[PDB]
């Protein structure tokens, strides 16, 4: 029988990849009509997927950039069993896999990494594995700081985003896992913290990092530990007062300042 999606879709009928484990991955592409100026990754966080990330990916296409993600595993339409991995490491693997197929295609092009929460976190960990490699890296509120089949249970929704809309849109999406992290898998997001913690004293990348002073997820103290201990030449924090984690789901003041910011320091680093 032909390779289903966890809802039985057949992955020939949609775009995907095979990682190095043999499992499907399922991908999104937003490619521009004229010619890329540049290649950029978006990397999703613990529980949500890459079709969140539409409204964002639809303004970074009208730059000229060729917007490329694909589900985690354990996550959205791709293989392998719900918030579950056996090293924290596959999520890194998998996203240089993908960048390298893309970089092939479209030679000397420069490629960033946009990545949030746990994304944020595989995004740190992918421009360490390869130094000087990444024209940039954008972070939205990154996991930086702190019997298996136990869950640690349910997250109250509320904490996400302060605009009650997006929050109702997350509890409603059937792609979006909002049962409570796993145990296992809580060991794994300890380990990704202790390695960012130590890939920050050869952390060289260009980043940009937008962080909500009333995130309750990841406490912006982490943002500043990031902005202090990476050694990056060219290192940006913006904080927004009172904003939740979902930033780019947050009130339309936030969001609109987080969509142009975005659009100003990748569009400043393109040519």
Request: net charge neutral; glycine share 8%; with cysteine.
């Amino acid at each position: 029988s032909p390779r289903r999606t966890p809802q039985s879709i057949p992955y020939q009928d949609l775009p995907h990849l095979v990682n190095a484990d043999g499992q499907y991955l399922f991908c999104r592409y937003w490619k521009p009509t004229g010619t890329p100026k540049a290649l950029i990754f978006v990397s999703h966080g613990a529980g949500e997927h890459s079709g969140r990330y539409e409204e964002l990916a639809r303004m970074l296409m009208g730059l000229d950039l060729l917007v490329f993600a694909h589900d985690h595993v354990g996550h959205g339409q791709s293989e392998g069993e719900r918030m579950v991995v056996s090293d924290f490491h596959v999520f890194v693997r998998d996203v240089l896999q993908h960048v390298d197929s893309m970089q092939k295609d479209y030679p000397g092009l420069p490629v960033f990494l946009l990545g949030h929460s746990m994304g944020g976190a595989i995004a740190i960990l992918t421009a360490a594995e390869r130094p000087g490699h990444f024209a940039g890296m954008v972070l939205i509120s990154p996991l930086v700081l702190a019997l298996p089949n136990l869950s640690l249970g349910p997250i109250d929704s509320s904490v996400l985003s302060r605009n009650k809309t997006e929050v109702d849109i997350y509890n409603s999406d059937p792609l979006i896992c909002r049962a409570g992290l796993k145990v296992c898998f809580g060991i794994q997001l300890l380990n990704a913290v202790s390695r960012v913690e130590r890939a920050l004293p050869k952390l060289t990348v260009p980043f940009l990092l937008l962080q909500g002073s009333a995130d309750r997820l990841c406490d912006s103290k982490g943002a500043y530990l990031l902005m202090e201990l990476a050694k990056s030449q060219d290192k940006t924090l913006k904080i927004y007062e009172g904003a939740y984690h979902v930033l780019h789901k947050e009130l339309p003041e936030v969001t609109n300042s987080v969509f142009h910011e975005i659009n100003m320091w990748v569009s400043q680093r393109t040519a």
